[model samples]
Target: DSVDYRKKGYVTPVKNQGQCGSCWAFSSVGALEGQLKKKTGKLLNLSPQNLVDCVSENDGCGGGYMTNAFQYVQKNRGIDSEDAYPYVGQEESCMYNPTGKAAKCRGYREIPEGNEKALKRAVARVGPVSVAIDASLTSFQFYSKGVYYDESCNSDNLNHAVLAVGYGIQKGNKHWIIKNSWGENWGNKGYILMARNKNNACGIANLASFPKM
Candidate 1:
């Protein structure tokens, strides 16, 4: 789960950017993990492995249902199929009835609508919030796989998810400090200083973790 807390909460597992359209699912689980810790007072290591193979909405592995992926986590209580539902680092066609390798997506919260105002409030009061951006064209030389921003791209071009940790100023605009799961070895030690308010579409959809059911 992504939070802007001075210290990051329990870091979720490293998901394979594999030929899998499960980033949405992984992010959904990531949010639930923090909430799980907040409510249950227990740091949980969840998995998006299940979501990648089980989630139904988009075509198969080619893509998945973003919102529905959240529902799947709530149902499975957080998955753990790293070994069973092994990942391959790139999206691939979803294999129906692939293999019930994941532990089952389960959680105890809701995913808020990417509200810009509320998101800012959360940043001020809470910490960083996990968000999904359409980085389908962000030429993130640091990271590979997804579409990168080569030309002047907007927030609408973001499709990658990350945690907003803090806010800072760049040149003359305020920017949000983000941490990524790309490993400290990738993307500037898994950190980027992008324009906070729509500069890189950071506020396009400030997501939050709603109460669990």
Candidate 2:
């Protein structure tokens, strides 16, 4: 009745986004991390701050997407590790030159929009996937556990980014296991069980995608 990426040792530790709106960065990095771990047994944390600073096509902290971030890595050949280009919680100039990065993606692809079943299949087969959801509600911030099924979150209003690592039923409630960028102190150690198979609840399947390592 469940698929736990954490139990499989594919899901990485929770991360805090601080006051920045760089959830997109975290989501993209989380997906790549999962893929890298699955493919190479390496759990290196890629630098999101590098994307924030260098990806001129994206608005740093203001907004971005997993596809764009992956494209940046693909075009540039690779990205630096978090240790080399650590996050500053705020945007700054790009310091990742051609010689110092750690990893790169061969490519990436977008999941079918608004398709819960498709998202489920992708998450099951391709490691974690980066997705955007409508996280403007107060409940999302205070969510502790249980299958989140907020009706206030609109599919067309997706804002926050997260990773869908696994899925299953929780006491008759089907849910997607989501990893957030809010730190371990918040929500089930910074993970959220969002209502899944609910026709794109919370826009969980709206903007889903993952990188190819």
Candidate 3:
């Protein structure tokens, strides 16, 4: 009834997106980090700020999507690391150095629309998958413990992106272990156990995908 990638040494630490609405960047980097770890047996702290400003067709600090970020990395050849271009919690001039790229992606793919089983397969076999959810609900902002089951969260109007690293059941309540960018103080240390197998609770399955190292 579970597949805890954390125990398997695949998932990386939670991250912070700060004042910027760069949740998309964090989601893409989070999945990339998991795939990169499985590929090289090394955990590299890549830069989400790079995706925030560097990824074309994206609104820096305003909003964006995960697939577009993946395409940017693929087209740009590689992405930089946090060491090279640190996050300032806001948009800045793109400081991408092509020659010193910290990571690169072969490609990325989207799961079938509203398919939790497919999402589970992606997380279990490939790596953590990039996901977008209806984070507009007020309760989501202050979620502390327990599976997030927001009935009002818009399924078609997703405004926030996150990483789905694994799955499990807590006290008979099935949930997806997700990594957020709201700092460690939020949720379960910058993570959330989202309600799973409930018709894409909070749009968790509406638009989901992952990178193929």
Give the top-scoring candidate (lDDT).
2
lDDT of every model, 2 decimals? 0.51, 0.88, 0.87
Q: Give the per-residue lDDT digits (tens) of candidate 3, residues 101-180.
A: 88898789999999999999888888788999988888998999999897888889888899998998998889999989
Kindly list the per-residue Cα lDDT of model 1 for residues 18-42, writing each as its tens digit. 5555566555555556555555555
Cα-based TM-score, every candidate: 0.64, 0.96, 0.96
Per-residue lDDT for 52 in model 2?
A: 87
lDDT of 2: 0.88
Clashes of each: 42, 0, 0
After superposing candidate 2, which stretches have Cα over 4 Å from the reference?
none
Error of 1 at 185 (Å): 3.1
lDDT of 2 by residue, 1-213 (tens): 568888887877899989888999999888888888889887778788988898888888898878999999999998888988899999998788756677789999898889898888898888899999998899988999899998877889888899999999988999999999989998998999999877788889989999988
Q: Which ten residues in a row have the lowest lDDT in candidate 1?
A: 101-110
- Regions of model 3 farther than 4 Å from truth: none
Q: Which runs in model 1 stand beyond 4 Å of their true positions?
A: 1-3, 6-8, 13-16, 76-115, 123-128, 137-139, 143-151, 165-173, 181-183, 198-203, 206-213
